[PDB]
Design a protein around this ligand. Sequence first.
Ligand code: HEM
Ligand SMILES: CC1=CCC(C(C)C)=CC1
Length: 137
Amino acid sequence: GFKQDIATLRGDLRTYAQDIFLAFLNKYPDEKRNFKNYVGKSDQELKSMAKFGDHTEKVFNLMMEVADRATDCVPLASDASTLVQMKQHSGLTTGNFEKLFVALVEYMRASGQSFDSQSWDRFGKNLVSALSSAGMK
Ligand code: HEM
Ligand SMILES: CC1=CCC(C(C)C)=CC1
């Protein structure tokens, strides 16, 4: 289920984070603008940029905490508020987070593994709803 999936992802988080974030940027090339430093790079080049591995793993570190603190795939409002309020998310709208979770669910569906892809899909929708409620455009 969802909680086991948190444990699975955490057991190889650096590689899951990079592969899911690459799936996101490759599915939605326009999203690299938020990361202008990732333009004109192949997957292998990106996985050799310090900020790429460091920042992507920190994104998923916090994403797993938010997933872990959720009840029935509904995140804490306090977690939503942190994500809306972070200076690094100044630019963003809910659509950015929706696209990331579409890529994450697709990744899970295409993997050989028994991820509860349906729970992650609900988690993404519930996080987008919570981000809107916490004042993301
Ligand atoms: C649940 C989803 C997400 C979580 C938990 C999250 C978390 C974080 C964290 C912890 C950082 C700080 C990383 C660091 O400074 O090393 C960060 C930075 C950032 N996040 Fe997010 N993030 C999420 C989704 C997104 C999405 C969807 C976008 C854009 C589409 C985005 C854009 C950024 C940007 C531009 C930065 C700063 C630039 C950079 O770190 O290189 N994040 N995020
Ligand atoms: C915060 C943050 C930094 C870098 C990445 C890369 C995987 C593109 C993701 C989000």
